[PDB]
Symmetry: C2
Subunit: 124 residues, 2 copies
């Protein structure tokens, strides 16, 4: 039942399409870089290109079930996924040693908070 | 009251004297936030503790720290960043809709900051 990342990115954007007040919240925590599948859709939604063919198709998709009060749990899972990936990617990266250290600690901390139910921003 | 350059040095000197404060700071700020002390911040993140600018800051005699005073100075540094966005975003090349979103983000950030919250600069 745990969704695919592409499904989760669609879901998150679909909530932002249906209720633009949720975009106001989400831009506190995520940016375009976070998305691995639906970056163009998020970008178009940010520039109110509301007739963009990708965004239209997502707004029209019949298989993305939204629920009252359900947005923040899916935003939190998208962010949690991003930081879980960081935990794998940082040790493989070119970052100076002390920055790998800092960044690993920050990703672990974020994962803790996300699971405590708190939203956490992705800066980098 | 404090110049931006002084606030930046004061923020970095807290981070230099206590690395646990860096752990807190990197939740909210990045080198791009700094206008005057970017090289120093980058040196501290890189643990280049003999960087000559970082050392000048370490040795500065006019940056007394207050116990528990860090978050006040970090919040002011974030507030000033978002106050500048209010001035600079309208003069940018961003398309209108994006200017709107960014400015609303800044106004909302400033409202939280004034209530004592830290807000991330993304």
């Amino acid at each position: 039942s745990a969704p695919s990342l592409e499904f989760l990115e669609k879901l998150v954007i679909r909530y932002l399409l249906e209720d633009r007040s949720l975009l106001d919240l989400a831009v506190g925590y995520i940016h375009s870089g976070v998305f691995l599948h639906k970056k163009q859709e998020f970008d178009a939604l940010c520039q109110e290109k509301l007739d963009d063919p990708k965004l239209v198709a997502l707004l029209l998709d019949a298989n993305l079930p939204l629920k009252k009060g359900g947005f923040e749990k899916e935003l939190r899972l998208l962010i949690l996924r991003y930081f879980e990936r960081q935990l794998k990617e940082i040790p493989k990266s070119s970052l100076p040693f002390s920055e790998k250290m800092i960044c690993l600690k920050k990703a672990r901390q974020a994962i803790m908070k996300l699971k405590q139910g708190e939203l956490v921003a992705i800066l980098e």
